[PDB]
Design a protein around this nucleic acid. Sequence first.
DNA 1: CCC
Lengths: 113, 103
Amino acid sequence: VISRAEIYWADLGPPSGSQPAKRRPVLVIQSDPYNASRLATVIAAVITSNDALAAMPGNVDLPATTTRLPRDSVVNVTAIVTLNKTDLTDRVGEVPASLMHEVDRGLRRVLDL
Amino acid sequence: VISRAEIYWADLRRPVLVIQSDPYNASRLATVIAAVITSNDALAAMPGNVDLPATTTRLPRDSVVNVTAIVTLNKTDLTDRVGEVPASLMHEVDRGLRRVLDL
DNA sequence: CCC
């Protein structure tokens, strides 16, 4: 069972330029009706320890004490990936509603929505 | 110069629809977010997906914007421009994205 | 330049 705003570890694939890659935490941003459906995949935003040299308006600071990640991290709202559900076995934690609202504002900015 | 609603051929070979907004497209950001286009007619039946009749885009076949297939690509890998998705259909794409992402 |  995968839910929006949950954080998982995921393989993002081999490196290719600045494409998301390697094993990283990811934040599920796909909505729960799709998460509960027969759809094989989930959309997520990539989390990094910081966004040094990739600092975008809309990026969101995630305190370690709020997410259960080992360190303070950042949601990179311009780094979006689609992953297989069956590959999301490694559950880390979650982002609370108040902070997820900031993530949503960032995504709306990035996608002109 | 990459703009929202443009269709490009991309190595994932598939057509992709730029959904990243133009301030980010014009910035030094190295990447662009896109929705994957497919010519599998069955996917027209998935809620949120947007049907693109061949005559509405310059693609060779009837296609579908798959709003659940989102990729982030290097800008420099978007060289092969097809055209644009017209405003009317882009509004449907936006609605689909809002549904899929709870936005 | 899907099946």
